[PDB]
Amino acid sequence: NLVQFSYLIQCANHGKRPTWHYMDYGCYCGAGGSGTPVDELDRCCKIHDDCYDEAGKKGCFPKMSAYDYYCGENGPYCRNIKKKCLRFVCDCDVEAAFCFAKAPYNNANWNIDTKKRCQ
């Protein structure tokens, strides 16, 4: 999951910020998953969790291999067609990489008290 997701995030945001900046943000960007998303970047992470829960109920995890993608001028896009579970997880990852690149990064929402703000 994380290695290829990091390449898609870095492609979409052009290098603006390191992937780790999105790993402990709000209520949903990171390990847990409770409460209401604190902002539009946090809503990106919640949709990505919904997407990964759907992929798991379709038997798409663990990943058979690396999915196919290309980083063009355009930003990243997925290229698997015949391998359906690899295309489904890549779609989840590239929609969150674009969402992240377009959402404002609110520095006050990095590493919050999640037991309190999301519960």
Ligand-binding site membership of 30 (annotated): yes
- By C-alpha distance, which of 36, 93, 32, 18 is closest to 60? 93
Using alpha carbons only, give the angle 61, 64, 65 rounded to the nearest 5 degrees.
125
- Extents of the domains making up the chain: 1-119
- By C-alpha distance, which of 47, 53, 54, 38 is closest to 114? 38
3-state DSSP call for residue 13?
coil
**Residues carrying an active site annotation:** 48, 93
3-state DSSP call for residue 41?
helix
Q: What experiment produced this structure?
A: X-ray
Distance CA 86, CA 78 (A): 9
Ligand-binding site membership of 28 (annotated): yes
Q: How far is CA 86 from CA 10, 13, 20, 52, 61, in A?
A: 20, 22, 24, 12, 9
Question: What does this entry list as its resolution, in Å?
Answer: 2.0
Q: Answer for the pair 49, 27: CB distance below 8 angstroms, yes or no.
A: no
Ligand-binding site membership of 56 (annotated): no
Distance CA 70, CA 7 (A): 10
Q: Left (φ > 0), alpha (ψ -120 to 50) or beta: where does 29 sit?
A: beta
Distance CA 54, CA 44 (A): 16
Pick the CATH number of 1-119 from 3.40.430.10, 1.10.260.40, 1.20.90.10, 3.30.2020.30: 1.20.90.10
